[PDB]
Structure formats: C-alpha cells, structure tokens
Paper text:
QCs belong to the family of aminoacyltransferases and catalyze the cyclization of N-terminal glutamine/glutamate residues of peptides and proteins with concomitant release of ammonia/water. Glutaminyl cyclases (QCs) from the oral pathogens Porphyromonas gingivalis, Tannerella forsythia, and Prevotella intermedia represent attractive target enzymes for small-molecule inhibitor development, as their action is likely to stabilize essential periplasmic and outer membrane proteins by N-terminal pyroglutamination. Crystal structures of the enzymes from P. gingivalis (PgQC) and T. forsythia (TfQC) reveal a tertiary structure composed of an eight-stranded β-sheet surrounded by seven α-helices, typical of animal type II QCs. In each case, an active site Zn ion is tetrahedrally coordinated by conserved residues.
Numbering used by the authors: 41 to 329
Amino acid sequence: ADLFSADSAYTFVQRQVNFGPRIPGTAPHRACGDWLVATLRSFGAAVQEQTAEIKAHDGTMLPMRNIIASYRPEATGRMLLMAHWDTRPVCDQDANPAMHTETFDGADDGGSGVGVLLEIARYLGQQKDLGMGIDIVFFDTEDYGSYGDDESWCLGSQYWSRNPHVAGYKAEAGILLDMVGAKGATFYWEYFSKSYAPGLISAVWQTAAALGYGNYFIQADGGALTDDHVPVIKNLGIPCIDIINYSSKNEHGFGDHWHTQRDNMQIIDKNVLDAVGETVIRYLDEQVK
Ligand SMILES: [Zn+2]
C-alpha cells in the first residue's frame, strides 16, 4: 500500500459532507462544486464544467453541473474515472418512515467516490510525465430519480454520454466508483460491468487480490445495477466497470445505510476507502507508465 493515502481520501469525504447535502439546486451543491473544481485545478487537472438545464421525472428543473477534469488532454489514449457527487434529496429508505421527507449526508452515496477520485487526482498532480490521458468525471444528478422509472437516474451521465465535452471523445476503459466507503462493503461483479468489460473487471479484481483486498473485492456475480457506467457503455462504447457496494444477500442489495439517515460520516471506514483507492491507483499505475 504505497501510493494512495486513505487519510487524505477520508478527509475529502468529510469536506463534501461539511457543506451540507449536495442536493441539485441548493446552495451547498453550488458551493461544493466550486470547491470540487478549485480543488481539482489545484491538483494540476485542466478542469472543464458542463452545465445544462434538465427536467427531472417530477418536473423539477435541475441546474445539472457535470465536472470534467483532464490530465494530458491531447493524448489519444485515455483512462476514464467516474463518480456522482450529488446527494439524493431524501432518505426514502429510512427505517423510520417519518424521515422519508428529510435529508441525509450521503457520505458514502456520493461522498466516497469523489473522495477517492480526489485523492487519486492529487497523486496525478505530482506525476512528471504520463503516457495516457486521464479524465476524472464527476456526474451530477445521478440520484434524483424515482424507483419505478429507471431512466430518471444518471441524468448527468446520460447527458454527458450523449454530449461529451470533446468531439469524438474516447477512452480505453472506464471505472465508476459508487459507494466505496461503507464499513464492511462487498464489491461483487456488477452484471453489465462483467458483460461489457470482462478483461477490465478481471484486471481490477486481480489487482485487489494481489494487494490482499480479497476480503473486499469478491470474485463472484453480484447485481445488475443501472449506474452511471451504463449510459457510457451504450452511447460512448467505452467498456466500463462499477466498483459498488452491493450484495445479493442484503435486504436492499445495497448496504443498509443506503438512502438512509445512516449514510453519514459515521458509516465510513478508512480501510474500505484504502482498499478501493489503493486498488484503482495501482491498476492506474501499470496502465499508464
Ligand atoms: Zn443513491
């Protein structure tokens, strides 16, 4: 475990939570994005913002704000990293049905992904020369949908996959982190990831294995999850995988903190942040020399 600092990654999750819920349209969301952008620029990334007015399933007009951060943007060969940074406006799945109208921190559901990819970004800023381009993409408005309407989620990755920030954008492989910080998390093979990126899924999970993270990266089928990686595979043709906390043996599949007031800084395990983080950076190290 040489290249990735989980303490830094953990602090990055605390800092996002500090603004308050990153609910599209609200002030914290505005502030967090500025700080996201500033922070990425401070790590040497060329940071581009893609904003659009998008209407949600229930007619709310959201100020979508996708954040694209680039290293070596001239390079034709590119590695893609993804995470959603918005917070769902409600803990719809709280054990107490009175909480269903109220907000939660989303430290894992949103925070964790940005936090790891923030700490990767910093590591990138200290690389004298790089052989591939790297795009880190923070999608917005992934968690605003409703449950009976599967294409009301991932609106940010929808918009971006149909209208990338570069004409003919392409990347060799995509990695999406979603809820990678909860204590005791289980990362199984997401079906679409396994289907469209078999070499990618194996290469990552074998890296984890070699690094001794097989208590976290389980080499076995998980779920068929609609996530930000799916639109990217359909519309951009990029083979993507989703490192996401899901188990077929959970009450909700996701961990019990999901869309729950318990999704907060108290649920985050630095060791789980380290496993995902140190795996992805290591896989990224050999793939860009
Ligand atoms: Zn969510």
